[PDB]
Amino acid sequence: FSVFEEITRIVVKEMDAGGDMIAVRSLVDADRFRCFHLVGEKRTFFGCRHYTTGLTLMDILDTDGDKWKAEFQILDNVDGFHHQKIKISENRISQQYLATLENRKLKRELPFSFRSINTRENLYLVTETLETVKEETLKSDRQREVTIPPNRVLSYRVKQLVFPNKETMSAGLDIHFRGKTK
Amino acid sequence: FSVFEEITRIVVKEMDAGGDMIAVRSLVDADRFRCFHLVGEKRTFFGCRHYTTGLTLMDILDTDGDKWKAEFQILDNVDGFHHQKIKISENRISQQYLATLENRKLKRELPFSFRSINTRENLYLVTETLETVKEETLKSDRQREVTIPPNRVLSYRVKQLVFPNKETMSAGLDIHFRGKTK
Amino acid sequence: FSVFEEITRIVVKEMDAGGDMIAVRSLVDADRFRCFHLVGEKRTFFGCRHYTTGLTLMDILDTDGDKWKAEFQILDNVDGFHHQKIKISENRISQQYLATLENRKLKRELPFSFRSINTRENLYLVTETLETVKEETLKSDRQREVTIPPNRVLSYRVKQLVFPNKETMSAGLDIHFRGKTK
Amino acid sequence: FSVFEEITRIVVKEMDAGGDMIAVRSLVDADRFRCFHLVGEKRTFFGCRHYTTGLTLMDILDTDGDKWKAEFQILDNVDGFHHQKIKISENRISQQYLATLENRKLKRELPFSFRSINTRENLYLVTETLETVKEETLKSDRQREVTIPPNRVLSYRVKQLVFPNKETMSAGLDIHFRGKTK
């Protein structure tokens, strides 16, 4: 019935066949589920299905930390029957920029410590921007043909980070098996 | 038979498939069921069906607290048979604005303390505005084709807050299991 | 057979599905069954069917107490077979205005004390104006197609008030279970 | 179902029938999986299928190390049924340039030592550039006809290198049997 899971997993599959990429479920905050954001805890009910909570993560702006690929198209159908008309835009971001962000000093008092400690979800971040400013409508059959605004994201990446009390570290080997001591 | 539950749950489902969002039942006060408002107590008769009472919550205006996405469309049908022609407008509101509202001092003498104590419904608030200034008519079959004025809301969010005698606190982890000591 | 109950309950149902709202039976005094008015005692013969008596309630005018939504339309049919062509006008009235009316001093010698004591109906008032200045004719089948003048009301609300000998109080939690000691 | 494996292995087969060449799985970073890059560890699940991680390897630029074939076409189909419309560009790079790169001094502090030691994947490099600036769409049947942006790579080569603590050496005899002591 649902269409966004189908579209995001089509992106993920043709993006790399059953690989590293992760899809998103909610567009309550999809476009603002950009880099420096979170995701709900993972459960296995009705297949691989997690929760959704992706609040902000920018901490400081003292050193250069906010400095700034062509259009891509997916116009096909899947035999229920689905029809996808996606267009994708890519803003290249450097990988050593991730190291720079790790070097950035972690210091905030945003009301996020309470929820983060209560969850212990060991939040992870994206690697490189995946953006869509595409058209509205897609199609699905069980009819219900969904509609999508421009400037929205579909799939995201993993870079595990650990948060001690004051300053953080990194776990880059795609660690999302929910095991930590924080 | 009823159409508004169908329309709001269609919004909720295609908004995120059976997820966090909550629909509304009454348009007695729908547009004025904006942020800073309430909802009736939850019961399980005829499925998930709650009551409806969403009175005002603005308390003080001393610091900046009243400062101020493109159009979205849903034009489909569901196989009874229903037909939806919804248009949606979005006014972006910041998430740290919720923290600012929590920091706002709670002080009122509005005749709401009596009803709030008699109910103990642990009221919860919305996250980001969901507005519709769309057309009038929709369609349904058992015929009865409903009509909807502009500048109205359909679905809302959760941010639990606890009210001690003088000043309040927050319960952000989507807590709506009606358990408190106030 | 009767049509006004059908029309008012259609208003109530699509107004909120089997919820707080209350319909009216008689148009002997419908338009003047505005705010500050009464209703007959409730009985359970032939379903939920009450009496009708809604006389005046204005008491004093010393402080500001008489200071002063767009058009709505319902153009459908119900499968007997009924056909409704209602238009509705709304004059917004504040909720803290109800608190102001409660603060208003109660003092009258209108010949209403005798009937009120003989009835003990614990009269209740409306919340916000519901007005119709719509067209005349509707349709019904068992034919008999009813006609309705402009500037008339269909459904009303509840705000229970208790009347001691001199000054009154409030019972806001939609209390209409006919229990009091006055 | 998957199409990129088919296309890359078609390249590999007609490039040399079941020979030295290696195909890639992910286009998360395909174009930037150029020379001086990595690959995920090799496993044998669902046939020959490895992981994917190809981060950067440039170390120093002091001596000449960044100084700088006609178009090729593959327009056929394979009897499921597939249809390929590939165009290929080649930028010739010298083989003694590989010796020069080996002579280049290895010295970096990029956050890659941790992941490299944790993996022990004994990374290997390409021999000569294989580039495609071709059209978008291909075709496949189980329909799903994939799309490909210009300036992207499909297949790559092997030149094993060993990394001691400070300075590296070479293992040129196409050694990718994951055996080392580093």
Numbering used by the authors:
A (entry chain J), B (entry chain K), C (entry chain L), D (entry chain I): 2 to 69, 81 to 91, 112 to 174, 194 to 233
Article passage:
Gasdermins (GSDMs) are pore-forming proteins that play critical roles in host defence through pyroptosis. Gasdermin (GSDM) proteins consist of an N-terminal pore-forming domain (GSDM-N), a C-terminal autoinhibitory domain (GSDM-C) and an interdomain linker. Recently, GSDMB was shown to exhibit direct bactericidal activity through its pore-forming activity. Shigella, an intracellular, human-adapted enteropathogen, evades this GSDMB-mediated host defence by secreting IpaH7.8, a virulence effector that triggers ubiquitination-dependent proteasomal degradation of GSDMB4.
We thus subjected GSDMB isoform 1 to cryo-EM analysis. The GSDMB pore was found to be 24–26-fold symmetric. 3D refinement of the 24-fold symmetric pore led to a final map at 4.96 Å overall resolution whereas focus refinement improved local resolution of the globular domain to 4.48 Å, allowing us to build an atomic model of the GSDMB pore using the structure of GSDMB in the complex of GSDMB/IpaH7.8 as a starting model. The interaction in the adjacent globular domains contains mostly residues from helix α3 of one subunit interacting with the region around α2 and β11 of its neighbouring subunit; and the α1 helix from one subunit juxtaposing end-on with the α1 helix from the next subunit through hydrogen-bonding and hydrophobic interactions. Previous studies have identified the N-terminal α1 helix (‘thumb’, binding site 1 (BS1)), the β1–β2 loop with a hydrophobic tip flanked by positively charged residues (‘wrist’, binding site 2 (BS2)) in the GSDM globular domain and a positively charged lipid-binding site (binding site 3 (BS3)) present on the membrane-inserted β7–β8 hairpin as structural elements for lipid binding. As expected, all three binding sites are conserved in GSDMB. BS1 and BS2 contain basic residues of R10 and K14 in the α1 helix and K43, R44 and R50 in the β1–β2 loop interacting with the acidic lipid head groups, and hydrophobic residues of F46 and F47 in the β1–β2 loop hydrophobic tip inserting into the lipid bilayer as a membrane anchor, whereas BS3 is mediated by basic residues of R174 and R195 in β7 and β8. Surprisingly, the density of the region 2 in GSDMB pore is also visible, regardless of the relatively lower resolution. However, only one basic residue (R229) is structurally conserved in the GSDMB isoform 1 pore. Due to a four-amino-acid (222AGLD225) insertion in the interdomain linker, the residue at the first position (P1) is replaced by a negatively charged D225. Substitution by an acidic residue at this position probably weakens membrane attachment by repelling the acidic membrane surface, thus attenuating the pore-forming activity of GSDMB isoform 1.
